[PDB]
Design an enzyme around this catalytic site. Structure first.
Site, PDB file in Angstrom:
ATOM      1  N   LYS A 265       0.833  -1.197   0.000  1.00 52.11           N
ATOM      2  CA  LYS A 265       0.000   0.000   0.000  1.00 52.11           C
ATOM      3  C   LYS A 265       0.869   1.249   0.000  1.00 52.11           C
ATOM      4  O   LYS A 265       1.946   1.250  -0.594  1.00 52.11           O
ATOM      5  CB  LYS A 265      -0.939  -0.017   1.205  1.00 52.11           C
ATOM      6  CG  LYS A 265      -1.925  -1.161   1.139  1.00 52.11           C
ATOM      7  CD  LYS A 265      -2.917  -1.109   2.276  1.00 52.11           C
ATOM      8  CE  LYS A 265      -3.915  -2.257   2.192  1.00 52.11           C
ATOM      9  NZ  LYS A 265      -4.898  -2.227   3.314  1.00 52.11           N
TER      10      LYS A 265
ATOM     11  N   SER B  44      -7.843  -9.568   6.808  1.00 51.54           N
ATOM     12  CA  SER B  44      -6.648  -9.455   7.626  1.00 51.54           C
ATOM     13  C   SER B  44      -5.959 -10.803   7.716  1.00 51.54           C
ATOM     14  O   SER B  44      -6.541 -11.783   8.182  1.00 51.54           O
ATOM     15  CB  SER B  44      -6.990  -8.959   9.029  1.00 51.54           C
ATOM     16  OG  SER B  44      -6.934  -7.548   9.088  1.00 51.54           O
TER      17      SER B  44
ATOM     18  N   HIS C  21      -9.223  -2.422  -5.611  1.00 48.40           N
ATOM     19  CA  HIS C  21      -8.983  -2.590  -4.184  1.00 48.40           C
ATOM     20  C   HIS C  21      -9.996  -1.669  -3.494  1.00 48.40           C
ATOM     21  O   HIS C  21     -10.168  -0.511  -3.893  1.00 48.40           O
ATOM     22  CB  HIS C  21      -7.551  -2.185  -3.833  1.00 48.40           C
ATOM     23  CG  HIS C  21      -7.171  -2.496  -2.420  1.00 48.40           C
ATOM     24  ND1 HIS C  21      -7.653  -1.782  -1.344  1.00 48.40           N
ATOM     25  CD2 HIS C  21      -6.370  -3.458  -1.905  1.00 48.40           C
ATOM     26  CE1 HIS C  21      -7.164  -2.291  -0.227  1.00 48.40           C
ATOM     27  NE2 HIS C  21      -6.382  -3.308  -0.539  1.00 48.40           N
TER      28      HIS C  21
ATOM     29  N   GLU D  29      -9.923   0.152  -1.146  1.00 43.49           N
ATOM     30  CA  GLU D  29      -9.396   1.455  -0.764  1.00 43.49           C
ATOM     31  C   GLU D  29      -9.523   2.475  -1.890  1.00 43.49           C
ATOM     32  O   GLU D  29      -9.640   3.668  -1.632  1.00 43.49           O
ATOM     33  CB  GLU D  29      -7.942   1.329  -0.332  1.00 43.49           C
ATOM     34  CG  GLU D  29      -7.768   1.155   1.165  1.00 43.49           C
ATOM     35  CD  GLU D  29      -6.482   0.447   1.515  1.00 43.49           C
ATOM     36  OE1 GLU D  29      -5.473   0.682   0.832  1.00 43.49           O
ATOM     37  OE2 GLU D  29      -6.478  -0.342   2.477  1.00 43.49           O
TER      38      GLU D  29
ATOM     39  N   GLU E  59     -12.361  -9.392  -0.623  1.00 44.48           N
ATOM     40  CA  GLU E  59     -12.063  -8.532   0.513  1.00 44.48           C
ATOM     41  C   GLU E  59     -13.303  -8.355   1.384  1.00 44.48           C
ATOM     42  O   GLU E  59     -14.220  -7.611   1.030  1.00 44.48           O
ATOM     43  CB  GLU E  59     -11.598  -7.160   0.038  1.00 44.48           C
ATOM     44  CG  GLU E  59     -10.347  -7.180  -0.795  1.00 44.48           C
ATOM     45  CD  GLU E  59      -9.797  -5.787  -1.009  1.00 44.48           C
ATOM     46  OE1 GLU E  59     -10.542  -4.932  -1.535  1.00 44.48           O
ATOM     47  OE2 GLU E  59      -8.625  -5.550  -0.641  1.00 44.48           O
TER      48      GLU E  59
END
Lengths: 246, 246
Positions: free
Chosen positions: B10, B209, B93, B95, B163
């Site tokens: 990242k 995670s 992603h 994010e 995810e």
């Protein structure tokens, strides 16, 4: 006021084209202490370009994250830019405001982030065609500049760029006279909000379409301290554009 | 089906931390022909990383443009990525969906541009907590996958990543069983929309995670073929996570 000529390669180039290009650029003999010449390659091309360009040429990246280091996949923070000794960053280029929804709030946070990390910033702004025809040019630009101008602590480290969108890909053309007016007003805003010393210290570049043909008449203008060149910076003739500022 | 373990650094790292980290990574002895291990550094860090990591490690970038070369300041095109021999790219992603408003539309065009340029793509998707509490997991995921699944022409070059957002920053934890169910459904979706051969060929990684502790329980699952690791990949212990797949 030191002239500032920047090459925004945007999303263009290959290792070969760059090797060839930087080679030409390097042949131009200019004094870096009298003129600032910055090249902004694609992030993944930075290292390559930096190694190929001589010290007299500054380098930066076309964008920086408004967030710091952390969970932001795909972003490049100012902390990382600093660690890399990247000197400049472009912020608020209309292409990013347009395609990637960057807002004045973003431009502000990015600038603040950049300065906090000792990065010099080339901040862009300008009005659309619709905005110009409605006669809101000065209004729009005032709102845009005032969105971040109070963060500039050092007026050598922040360069403003006026992008006359109404002329970029609309069949219209911006004349030196017209840019001069807008530039003068942009500088006036800086004065009324930061002071005269600052206002005369900060460079204001023309971000419109610049080429070997119009550069001379543009740079001539009082309040045009140079330009952020687009496609013309992808050709060897770019040096002739740098020359018009020597 | 070949296991796939990726490190999504990242927006993190300094030339020094990376030099140190890649050092540890290089110490792990593994056969790249049996296991795919990819590191995704920050764009400006690609080169540095690529030179420091040994051939057995594949490298890629965290994002790619939906446009080709041209006037798109700040973007990296697949054409450029290919010229640099960048092997992988991460697309969609959460994010970038969250902070940068990337849509399924964007993911489709980015995937298309990627394959058209012979890049391997790690495509991410997943449902939010709100969407999971409303029992819309399968629905949401089905909509996301079907937004791009028809573009896959080679099921070795595209890697799917689930995810579970509902477990990222909400205080909740996804269990290997929960992940397994979703994974099976994702594969079922590919089966019905592309064929059984393709379905058993494509790798579906867990994007939640992952740490040195839970990696073994996860990789064990039938339909979990590896993971896209976050903060855990910024530590030396990441090698252990790789080992769990050897």
């Amino acid at each position: 006021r030191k002239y500032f000529v920047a090459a925004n390669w945007k999303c263009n180039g290959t290792l070969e084209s760059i090797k060839s290009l930087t080679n030409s650029f390097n042949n131009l003999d200019f004094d870096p202490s009298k003129l600032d010449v910055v090249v902004f390659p694609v992030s993944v091309h930075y290292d390559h370009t930096r190694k190929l360009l001589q010290s007299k040429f500054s380098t930066g990246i076309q964008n920086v994250s408004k967030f710091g280091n952390g969970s932001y996949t795909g972003e490049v923070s100012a902390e990382i830019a600093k660690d890399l000794n990247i000197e400049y960053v472009i912020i608020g280029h209309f292409e990013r405001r347009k395609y990637f929804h960057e807002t004045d709030e973003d431009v502000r946070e990015k600038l603040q982030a950049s300065l906090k990390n000792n990065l010099k910033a080339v901040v862009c702004f300008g009005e659309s065609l619709e905005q110009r025809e409605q006669n809101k040019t000065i209004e729009v630009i005032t709102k845009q500049v005032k969105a971040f101008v109070d963060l500039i602590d050092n007026f050598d480290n922040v360069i403003l760029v006026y992008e006359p969108l109404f002329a970029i890909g609309t069949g219209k053309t911006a004349t030196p006279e017209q840019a001069q007016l807008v530039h003068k007003e942009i500088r006036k805003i800086v004065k009324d909000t930061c002071g005269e010393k600052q206002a005369n210290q900060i460079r204001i570049l023309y971000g419109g379409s610049v080429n070997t043909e119009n550069c001379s008449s543009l740079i001539q203008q009082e309040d045009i301290d140079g330009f952020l060149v687009g496609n013309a910076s992808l050709k060897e003739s770019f040096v002739d554009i740098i020359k018009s500022a020597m």
